[PDB]
Amino acid sequence: IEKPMGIFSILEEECMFPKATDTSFKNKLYEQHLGKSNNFQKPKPAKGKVEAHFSLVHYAGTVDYNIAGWLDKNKDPLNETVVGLYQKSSMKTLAYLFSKGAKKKGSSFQTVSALFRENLNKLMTNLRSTHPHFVRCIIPNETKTPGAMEHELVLHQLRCNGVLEGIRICRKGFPSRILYADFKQRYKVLNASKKASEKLLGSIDIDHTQYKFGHTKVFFKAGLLGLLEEMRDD
């Protein structure tokens, strides 16, 4: 979306080109990306929806976009003599419009996506200069009946918040970092500290691939304690 020859760049090109049209934009997009990438892909005609034109995949699943109107919605050539008029007006409008050559575009090359990608990076840097924390206020139910919830709707809030992506990235590694406090007392039922952990692990039939006790806690994939859950009880 952001690199050169990306979607935004191509949209800018078509906002510059003499006689560009929505069909030319769609073509240029396809010929520049289709097949030559994986995220970008063709829309699927189904579901009675009017028109999709290209499908992207994000951390929150796939989504296909409609292209009609993107050209004349993005071009915004800011006039200059009228801005001078504003600067010289007698109201307080001039308070807004108060008055290098490299990387500055012309008053005829202006485009919305550019200002977006500019202030977006302004954020993504000044926010990158600050320690983060996160809160995800869900709405679990259509109406105001507390305690009761439906999954599909909170499933949507799951992806829009993408916390499932966090649990996935922490999910393909060692999610379970646990001490001996419960490990010894729950696993001594098969072979009735560190060397005691080695004894209690070699004896309950686990291979040395899907776990690791580094020096303080033992690290575990998720699906292995369930294997023990039913077996570490007898």
């Binding site: 050169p4 020859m5 760049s9 191509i10 800018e12 090109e13 510059m16 080109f17 003499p18 006689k19 240029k28 050559g101 490299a102 990387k103 500055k104 575009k105 012309g106 008053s107 005829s108 090359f109």
Partner: protein, 371 residues
């Protein structure tokens, strides 16, 4: 990073940054050298001015355009021009800026080659490219079809383009342009008693031409009119007073473009070569070309040229074809504008000629599709 767009032409160098809206720096592409000896020691007179500085020092210099008809004849003065452009007009190290160069069609290949070579050796740019002035002029007009009639100061060419395809066999170059009109005006201004012979006062004559001249919708009627009345005379003050007056000349001079016989050339007039270039194209695309006569370059900036042009080419063409003439009000810079537009593209960022590539393949690379 930013790309540079230097449109040389004759008469006027115009440069700027890709993506801008107008060339930042514009100055006459001349090199002057003193022709007296100078007597004030400590004045530290330099040995060769250039650009507006020479244009101001005219009185004691001898000016020499290093581009004659689209082609470069004195390479050292051209290098001085480029160096002055980069280091004073734009004040930018050309080390990290792909530059876009322009040239007329049907030029000596050695011109373009030596241009590339100097660009890569002397100034050591990261990349470069040479484009055809007419294509850029079409870009600037937001078209994609239509013959374009560029007419700068040294050359005049028609390029018919359709759907972005150029028909090269129908390109018509003609070596009649602003410099020739200036000379013819210098000539016919004698018959009133005014004598301008110095390379300096050729500039005076050029100013007179840019201010007073204009194309006449009907040559014979205007001639008879200027004969009868005197409502056409206009005065003009020279750099030392002594106002002068020109009458018939005002439209005699630019009339040449339609009757080149005035200066002894045999080729056909502007309208005629335009119509011929049309007729050489395939029959299925002639209506659009009739409808989209773009016009650029400073010589197409005469009051009335578009109307006379339309009348003539209408007289030549059939009657059921619509004749239109796209003459924007800023057309003098259409080449540079289109150049900035093109250079600012991203689908263009893979057409440049990389320094490494040129080192690999030598200046013969230009003619290759690294065009």
């Amino acid at each position: 990073t930013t790309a540079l767009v230097c449109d040389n032409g004759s008469g006027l160098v115009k440069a700027g940054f890709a993506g801008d809206d107008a060339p930042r720096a514009v100055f006459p592409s001349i090199v002057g050298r003193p022709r007296h000896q100078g007597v004030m020691v400590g004045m530290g007179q330099k040995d060769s001015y250039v650009g507006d500085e020479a244009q101001s020092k005219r009185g004691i210099l001898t000016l020499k355009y290093p581009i004659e008809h689209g082609i470069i004849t004195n390479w050292d003065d051209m290098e001085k021009i480029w160096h002055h452009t980069f280091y004073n007009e734009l004040r930018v190290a050309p080390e990290e800026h792909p530059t876009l160069l322009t040239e007329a069609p049907l030029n000596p290949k050695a011109n373009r080659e030596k241009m590339t070579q100097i660009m890569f050796e002397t100034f050591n740019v990261p990349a470069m490219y040479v484009a055809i002035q007419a294509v850029l002029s079409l870009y600037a007009s937001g078209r994609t079809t239509g013959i374009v009639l560029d007419s700068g100061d040294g050359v005049t060419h028609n390029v018919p383009i359709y759907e972005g395809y150029a028909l090269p066999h129908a390109i018509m170059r003609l070596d009649l342009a602003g410099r020739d009109l200036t000379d013819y005006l210098m000539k016919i201004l004698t018959e009133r008693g005014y004598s301008f012979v110095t390379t300096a006062e050729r500039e005076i004559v050029r100013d007179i031409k840019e201010k007073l001249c204009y194309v006449a919708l009907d040559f014979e009627n205007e001639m008879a009119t200027a004969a009868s009345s005197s409502s056409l005379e206009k005065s003009y003050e020279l750099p030392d007073g002594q106002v002068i007056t020109i009458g018939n000349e005002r439209f005699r001079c630019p009339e040449t473009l339609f009757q080149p016989s005035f200066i002894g050339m045999e080729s056909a007039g502007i309208h005629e070569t335009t119509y011929n270039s049309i007729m050489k194209c395939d029959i299925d695309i002639r209506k659009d070309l009739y409808a989209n006569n773009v016009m650029s370059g400073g010589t197409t900036m005469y009051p009335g040229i578009a109307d006379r042009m339309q009348k003539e080419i209408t007289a030549l063409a059939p009657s059921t074809m619509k004749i239109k003439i796209i003459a924007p009000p800023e057309r003098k810079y259409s080449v540079w504008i289109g150049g900035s537009i093109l250079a600012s593209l991203s689908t263009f960022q893979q057409m440049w000629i990389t320094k490494q590539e040129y080192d690999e393949a030598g200046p013969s690379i230009v003619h290759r599709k690294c065009f």
